[PDB]
Amino acid sequence: ASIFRCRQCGQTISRRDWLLPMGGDHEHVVFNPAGMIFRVWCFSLAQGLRLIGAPSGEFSWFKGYDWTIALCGQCGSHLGWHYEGGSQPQTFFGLIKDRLAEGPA
Ligand SMILES: Nc1cccc2c1CN([C@H]1CCC(=O)NC1=O)C2=O
Numbered sequence: 001a002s003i004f005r006c007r008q009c010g011q012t013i014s015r016r017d018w019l020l021p022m023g024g025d026h027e028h029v030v031f032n033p034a035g036m037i038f039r040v041w042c043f044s045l046a047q048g049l050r051l052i053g054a055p056s057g058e059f060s061w062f063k064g065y066d067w068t069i070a071l072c073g074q075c076g077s078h079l080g081w082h083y084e085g086g087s088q089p090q091t092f093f094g095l096i097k098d099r100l101a102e103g104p105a
């Protein structure tokens, strides 16, 4: 249980060692304007994504960060968001926990 892969195709995405306690917890539960609930795990680092378009501050769940949609680079599954433009850290990833599969290295 040390590597996280995309659930739909297996693409390598992150590691348990890279989880990031933002404001006290790596886990944050949030809703978007369409009412969807997301269990977001915060990671300092991720790979194998494709970040779409340019950042937006609108509706941001994390104060002072702007977001871009992060898709699985391989299969295009929406995996979460990349956050940037803030402070300590300047950037991180918010990944949707049930879209990942956890497993050995
Ligand atoms: N405006 C809009 C319309 C439909 C879906 C969604 C949004 C904005 N958003 C997310 C983007 C990431 C964030 O930090 N907060 C959100 O709310 C969505 O998942």
Ligand SMILES: [Zn+2]
Residues within 6 Å of the ligand: 006, 007, 008, 009, 010, 011, 072, 073, 074, 075, 076, 077
């Ligand atoms: Zn995938």
